[PDB]
Design a protein around this ligand. Structure first.
Ligand SMILES: CCCCCCCCCCCCO[C@@H]1O[C@H](CO)[C@@H](O[C@H]2O[C@H](CO)[C@@H](O)[C@H](O)[C@H]2O)[C@H](O)[C@H]1O
Ligand SMILES: CCCCCCCCCCCCO[C@@H]1O[C@H](CO)[C@@H](O[C@H]2O[C@H](CO)[C@@H](O)[C@H](O)[C@H]2O)[C@H](O)[C@H]1O
Lengths: 240, 179, 49
């Protein structure tokens, strides 16, 4: 139940971060809706596979959220950027926003599942632990692509308020107008930063190599275990 | 144990191999997938830094959380590269020009994703109470991993892409062509 | 589909490679026998007097 609680909080924190960038309650609702649909669908798939609700399946639900929310934002925001650029109405704006990235969605989920599928095949008694998690994540990724092909596009066509051509919302009022006018922050300052690290490039490659080294260093020096001891609110005392 | 052995290396080796094969199909290229895979350390460094300087261990919850960071950072790297390439194909745009143009348009969606997630998983790192051990363990690695992945990859992915395209030539590019 | 992969030789190779390495791994873990189970199973009751 404690994991259920952080799961609900994770969704609410996602909903707030969605609302910070997309500043429409209508628009941040879209990705937020997708989460409950994909996650509840995943529980159903768990039942299909004869799995149980446990710490590892529950941690699947939680970790999947970054993956799911990514699917939603990718579709939603790509529409946002089709509207502020061609002044198109929501129904058409998403129709070829989808027609141009629906292949990507399917493709990417495919390569991503390669990260988790082999782990499903871990063997032994301690094998079911890694497998529960992999199936949960891959299931969620599947449903998330389904939801991104079915509900999300529909929700974009009927929930997204129109954006005029060129509009970037840089003068709403108070804070929101601030963050937008200042979102070009260094969308410009950053891309001039990137353009700089490209002219040289020579020794940005060397930095990478220390990171790979420090990684190798940190990794060999970090001890390994299985599952941590937990405080279960009880214990025993042996007397002999 | 005398049954155990070592699954780790080979399974992740298989994983890296199947991921590379998938990326190759995606971009129709044997080389370009490298620009996406070089991002794997950037997130592992955070996971190590996080777990290290919090006395954590390399256990089940460390391993699964890293997979996630790697997945989500792979995904952000792929979206940048997909658009940098599609601008050199459907548009004529040269390398450096189509690299920055893809970085600009994907900066927002990237930070949206990473922050919303980094922040969404913080109730796990801050957790006290029953099962808090597993919630703290799985949580901190992902957060540290995601933060390192998400700040580093934002600068390194553009570097990966151009460096790779300029070792596997074509000997025509770098001035924007004509469709 | 053929027109699709004629233009995408690499995608075709990865499909074939992934299939092969999938099968390669399969061979490492597969039981070996002359026959599978082909005999009908039997149960014997034994008693002594
Ligand atoms: C973001 C939304 C989607 C994610 C939400 C996922 C959270 C779900 C995890 C809950 C853990 C499962 O906990 C489960 O709870 C239900 C509801 O009390 C219990 O169900 C019990 O009460 C319900 C309703 O009162 C009865 O219909 C049921 O017959 C009874 O068994 C289960 O016996 C218990 O095992
Ligand atoms: C391409 C995408 C995926 C890339 C992922 C690359 C990074 C993955 C790193 C994961 C960490 C691997 O870390 C490895 O975990 C295995 C678990 O099987 C540990 O295994 C160890 O602990 C277990 C605990 O039950 C023992 O049973 C086992 O005998 C022992 O060797 C290794 O000591 C460790 O080195």
């Amino acid at each position: 139940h404690e994991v259920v609680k952080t799961l609900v909080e994770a969704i609410i924190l996602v909903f707030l971060v969605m609302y910070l960038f997309l500043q429409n309650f209508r628009a941040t609702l879209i990705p937020t809706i997708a989460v409950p649909v994909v996650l509840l669908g995943t529980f159903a798939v768990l039942a299909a596979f004869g799995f149980s609700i446990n710490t590892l399946t529950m941690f699947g639900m939680v970790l999947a959220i970054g993956l799911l929310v990514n699917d939603a934002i990718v579709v939603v925001e790509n529409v946002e950027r089709v509207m502020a650029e061609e002044g198109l109405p929501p129904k058409e704006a998403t129709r070829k926003s989808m027609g141009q990235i629906q292949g990507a969605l399917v493709g990417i989920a495919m390569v991503l599942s390669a990260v988790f599928v082999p782990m499903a095949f871990f063997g032994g008694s301690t094998g079911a632990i890694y497998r529960q998690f992999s199936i949960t994540i891959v299931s969620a990724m599947a449903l998330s692509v389904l939801v991104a092909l079915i509900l999300t596009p529909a929700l974009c066509a009927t929930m997204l308020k129109p954006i005029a051509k060129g509009d970037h919302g840089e003068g709403k009022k108070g804070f929101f107008g601030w963050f937008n006018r200042m979102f070009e922050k260094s969308t410009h300052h950053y891309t001039d930063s990137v353009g700089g690290i490209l002219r040289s490039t020579g020794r940005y490659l060397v930095l990478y190599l220390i990171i790979v080294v420090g990684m190798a260093y940190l990794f060999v020096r970090l001890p390994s275990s299985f599952l941590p001891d937990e405080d279960q609110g009880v214990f025993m005392t042996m007397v002999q | 144990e005398r049954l155990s052995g070592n699954q780790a290396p080979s399974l992740y080796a298989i994983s890296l191999i199947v991921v590379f094969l998938c990326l190759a199909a995606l971009y129709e290229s044997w080389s370009i997938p490298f620009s996406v895979m070089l991002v794997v350390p950037l997130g592992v460094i955070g996971a190590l830094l996080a777990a290290t300087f919090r006395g954590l261990t390399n256990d089940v919850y460390f391993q699964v959380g890293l997979l996630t960071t790697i997945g989500l950072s792979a995904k952000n790297a792929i979206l940048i590269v997909e658009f940098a390439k599609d601008l050199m194909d459907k548009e004529g745009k040269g390398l450096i020009e189509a690299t920055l143009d893809a970085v600009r348009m994907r900066l927002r969606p990237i930070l949206m994703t990473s922050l919303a997630f980094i922040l969404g998983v913080m109730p796990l790192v801050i957790s006290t109470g029953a099962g808090s051990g597993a919630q703290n363990a799985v949580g901190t690695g992902v957060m540290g991993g995601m933060v390192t992945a998400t700040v580093l990859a934002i600068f390194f992915v553009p570097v990966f892409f151009v460096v790779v395209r300029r070792r596997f030539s074509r000997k025509n590019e770098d001035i924007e062509h004509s469709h | 589909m053929p027109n699709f992969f004629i233009d995408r030789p690499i995608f075709a190779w990865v499909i074939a490679i992934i299939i092969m390495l999938a099968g390669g791994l399969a061979i490492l873990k597969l039981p070996v026998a002359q026959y599978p189970t082909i005999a009908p199973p039997a149960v014997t009751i034994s008693a002594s007097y």
